[PDB]
Each structure stands twice: as structure tokens, then as C-alpha cells.
Structure 1
Amino acid sequence: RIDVYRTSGAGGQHVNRTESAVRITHIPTGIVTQCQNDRSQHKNKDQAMKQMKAKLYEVEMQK
């Protein structure tokens, strides 16, 4: 369940009217993960898939 919203902090106008930050919440696992580094919503969504793969790889490892 990919959520989208506006980035937080510095940036100017192009951070006030832009939903550039993403949050990918996995429904069955309950793990959440966000990103807001780059100005692009999908350069952040790339990151959020990456980190999200990482959190599941951690949990399936912990089993």
C-alpha cells in the first residue's frame, strides 16, 4: 500500500505543491518504510522499494 504526500523541510514552492515523499506500508507484514531524499516522487519510490526489500529480507532472516 504505497502512500504519497509532500516532503518535509527545505525546498521552496516545488516542495509545497509536490507530493515527492513516499511511504510503502506492507499490509500483511505491517512493516512501514518511507523516503524523501530526492526531489522526485519516484526517485524516492525507487528508494522505498529498495529499503522495503531490505526490511522483508531482515524479517524473513529473523525467522
Structure 2
Amino acid sequence: RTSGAGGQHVNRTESAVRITHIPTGIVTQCQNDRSQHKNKDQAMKQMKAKLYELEMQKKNA
């Protein structure tokens, strides 16, 4: 359920998503949009960006 901007109302939908990378353990969650598919897409972009940062930090060592 969308805890932010709608977590108060009696009727709550499973629009909020949380994508957790199984190997690394990095958690990512999006609740901005009312559609779970759009929230999944946004979380996918953020999680992939974080993984991009991980490889960059490996180079930055």
C-alpha cells in the first residue's frame, strides 16, 4: 500500500513498490505514482543507477 500520499484513506491500493537486489542487498522503493507499473519502472531506474554507482565506486578505488 502507498504509505505516502494516500496511506491515510480507508481505501488503499498496492501501488507502492519495493525492489530489492537479492545479491547486493540494496533496497529501492517508489510510491510517487498511482500505478504500480510506473512505480516499478521508476524503482528499476533507481536501482540500476545505484548499481552503476557501485561499479563507478569500484573504479574510484
3-state SS of 1:23 partner: strand
C-alpha distance in 2, partners of 1:20/1:37? 9
Cα deviation, 1:20-60, whole Å, max 9, x if unaligned, reads 00010001111110000010001100100000111100111
Q: How many residues align?
A: 57
- Structure 2 residue runs of 5 or longer lacking an equivalent are none
User: Which residue pairs with 2:4 in the alignment?
Assistant: 9
Cα deviation, 1:3-32, whole Å, max 9, x if unaligned, reads xxx001333898833100001000111111
C-alpha distance in 2, partners of 1:52/1:15? 31
C-alpha distance in 2, partners of 1:12/1:58? 32
Compared CA separation, residues 47 and 57, structure 1 to 2 (3 A): same
8 Å CA contact retained: 1:25, 1:32 = yes
C-alpha distance in 1, partners of 2:25/2:7? 33
3-state SS of 1:13 partner: coil
Q: Answer with 1 or 2: which has the greater Rg.
A: 2
**Alpha carbon RMSD of aligned pairs, Å?**
2.2
